Amino acid sequence: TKPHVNVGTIGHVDHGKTTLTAAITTVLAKTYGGAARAFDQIDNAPEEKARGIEINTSHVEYDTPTRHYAHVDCPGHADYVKNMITGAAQMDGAILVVAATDGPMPQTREHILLGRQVGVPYIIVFLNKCDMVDDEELLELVEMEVRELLSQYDFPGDDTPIVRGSALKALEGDAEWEAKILELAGFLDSYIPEPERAIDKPFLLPIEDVFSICGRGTVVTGRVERGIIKVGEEVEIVGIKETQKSTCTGVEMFRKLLDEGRAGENVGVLLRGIKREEIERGQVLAKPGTIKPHTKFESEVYILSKDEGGRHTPFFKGYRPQFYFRTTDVTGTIELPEGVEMVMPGDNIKMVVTLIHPIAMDDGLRFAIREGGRTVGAGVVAKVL
Template sequence: MMDDEELLELVELEIRDLLNRYDFPGDDTPIVRVSGLKALEGDPEYEQSVINLVDAMDEWIPIPPRATELPFLMPIEDVFGIKGRGTVVTGRVERGTIKVGEPVEIIRFGDTRATVATGLEMFHKQLDETVAGDAVGVLLRGVDRDEVERGQVLVKPGSMRPYTKAKAEVYVLSRDEGGRHTPFFSGYKPQFYIRTSDITGSIGLPEGVEMVMPGDNVQMDIELMSPVPLESGMRFRHPGGRPHRGVRRDNRGDGLAWQERTPISDRSSPCSAATAGNVTTRP
């Protein structure tokens, strides 16, 4: 354990300087000196320091807002069959709420499957209701283990539908930014990581654009081999986990961004329009 007071003060100054450099209130942020080992050994000073740390976190770290007012959506991360009970899907609730006994839909790769949530569990605790942000297991009525898989989504009935085509305006990260080293061309077929799914898709470049270099901004058409639920502004990643960043969205290098979707057929679902862009569906 570091016990040099001058060195501790120097480290604290460096931490505050780093926070200020990235536009955090470094001069005002509390820095609590803690030793978990000493606290476990029963040292009263460090036992209190752990309490002080938790109090500071409660005061300074805001609770992220949860999108509880939106329709229920949970990307499926894993699937389990429980003998005598049925099939359980697990994941983190992205938005909305769900209660035991409520109907849900599984949006699969090409169709939907109606069912009912007959049980909810989080960390071995049975729940009556779960909300956005919770990591839960959902027991589904009448669904066989082989009818559902990772990458599909569980939603409020009628709230979403799958798409195969989208138009995206993107910025491609350069090599110095941790992105691509080489250009790509129209017809390029990467893997797209959308929520928990891994889908092959084809990229079409606009007329007059022969190739896209790292560091370019470009609008492109994307056609996926299997339909998946898409929404305005959602993020995804390009093959190999190489980060891309969508323009006009705060993606923090996390992925390409769908800038907009506008229905162009009677079978398209509602959308939010802000800039030019179209999505077609092909169930």
């Protein structure tokens, strides 16, 4: 029915993220129905588990007349880091909360940096605690500082919606301040475009298995990740080996002959021309010229602490783990930042990875770092080199 959008509040400690998350739920419920959530209920965030990594995060849900929002608010800076790198749902947009009394702070910069790194596509800013500021020239100064900050990290600072308000006075009931929270909900709907449906994205099928039907040819199996493959359409086999071009000669679902295969369907794609021996672990079927194979990439990664089931010892320059992209582990070489000799468990770093085999890759692709068969960390492709 109504579109679902994943948002969240980012910004420095005590700028007003939780108060704002409360005010959003409260004002939207007071204006056009729903259940209002108190500050206390969002503040003491429960602990969530993302494959062994522990993250304190509050998941609040609210509705505007057209959209349904799944909103994340975390207590500490460490949770934001973990959540942006491996968190359950990738943000479609973010609300950057900036206290007009403090202006941009170290975590303001960090969240903006991580946001682009991790591929958060839209940022709306709520200039909080304006009830405390009597100087209009001061508000303009903070606003200009925030727009400069966003532009520094490739966000369109000059075109970013900035709402001047007070999250506390709005949670309190003050109509004049409650208007500004409605203006913010308006920007969520107008500035963040409708999220792209999996079925409307270019066709991609990560290859889970290969078989060869007698007389029909090679069958490649998997769950259609995105788009639609119709019988007769041209396809590319991208991964370890040099990219191959073929044609979908059939689509099968447990004996049922389909004319097409859509996103979320477990399907068997027939390829006339391709031989079984040409298909390798980690290959992908995709709409020709929509994905490129790469070996070298820049990534933002988090290494599990011993407590999270990860290693107890640090790793060094010579570390060569397995990178689990979609279907298989691929061994990679690591380049640590200038001056970094070792990486401790529980740390996050910028890692330049060189895979032994190319992998169909785009910025924003998430992966797992495994040493045995055990997860030692998680990452996101920031830049494809």
